Write a protein that binds this ligand. Structure first.
Ligand code: VGK
Ligand code: CL
Ligand code: CL
Ligand code: CL
Length: 242
């Protein structure tokens, strides 16, 4: 449980994230590096409590945080977590834009099912760059214009998460967010009228309908996590598999 127990293989992104290999058994992992050296004791107490709660989240659709390593020599904190070889959803969406190719409805149903179960777990106790893919088609929740801001949270709620999920699934389908604008104020205007284009016609009316419900202006009209999973679109094979 010290940094020397792992070899860095290479940097994923820049704190900073790195793909690492545990020496004892060759297990591929990643860590996130936080420099606390510029933090106060109150800020560091916050950081430790937060990290300790992250350690508790054990769920197949949430990024698993295994360990925390302190290198007081560097004043660097390392959060060691599972490696998701598939990258994040943001890159999937970008790939699709680039290669002019829409994502499979089956893939979208997998994201919808597994992300909804992730939220369900969070509520029991959201953007593409915060959604990760493993090697076996599993989706995991981890960790500028606020494209996904819900109407209500734009004024002063578990139904706000549903809205944000709706925006994410929408953008997975259309390869663009449901409400776009050049300024934030234009954005807010668009979000308030609550109008948007149908996802592309290659997607079934049933898929269109549930994404559209999640994007209702009134939070009480949005489906709950439980109503979402009850939908006939959502089958066993859309769930996680080891
Ligand atoms: C395909 O390469 C990429 C991998 C990742 C990536 C892989 N595993 C991870 N655990 C993470 C990751 C998950 C959560 C957090 C957090 O909670 O702060 C941090 C990292 C990421 C990511 C990529 O792009 C962002 C990759 O593409 C090069
Ligand atoms: Cl296209
Ligand atoms: Cl399809
Ligand atoms: Cl269209």
């Amino acid at each position: 449980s010290r940094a020397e127990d792992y070899e860095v293989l290479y940097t994923i992104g820049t704190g900073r994230c790195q793909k690492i290999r545990r020496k004892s058994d060759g297990k591929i992992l990643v860590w996130k590096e936080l420099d606390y050296g510029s933090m106060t004791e109150a800020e560091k107490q916050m950081l430790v409590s937060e990290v300790n709660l992250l350690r508790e989240l054990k769920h197949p659709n949430i990024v698993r945080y295994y360990d925390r390593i302190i290198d007081r020599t560097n004043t660097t904190l390392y959060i060691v977590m599972e490696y998701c070889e598939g990258g994040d959803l943001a890159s999937v969406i970008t790939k699709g834009t680039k290669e002019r190719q829409y994502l499979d409805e089956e893939f979208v149903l997998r994201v919808m099912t597994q992300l909804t179960l992730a939220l369900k777990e969070c509520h029991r106790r959201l953007k593409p760059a915060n959604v990760f893919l493993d090697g076996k088609q599993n989706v995991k929740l981890g960790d500028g214009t606020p494209y996904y801001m819900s109407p209500e949270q734009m004024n002063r709620n578990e139904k706000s998460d549903i809205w944000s999920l709706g925006c994410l699934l929408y953008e997975l389908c259309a390869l663009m967010p449901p409400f776009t604008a050049f300024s934030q104020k234009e954005l807010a205007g668009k979000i308030r009228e609550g109008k948007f284009r149908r996802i592309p016609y290659r997607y079934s009316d049933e898929l269109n309908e549930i994404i559209t419900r999640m994007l209702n202006l009134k939070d009480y009209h949005r489906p709950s996590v439980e109503e979402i999973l009850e939908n006939p679109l959502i089958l066993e094979h859309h769930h996680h598999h080891h």
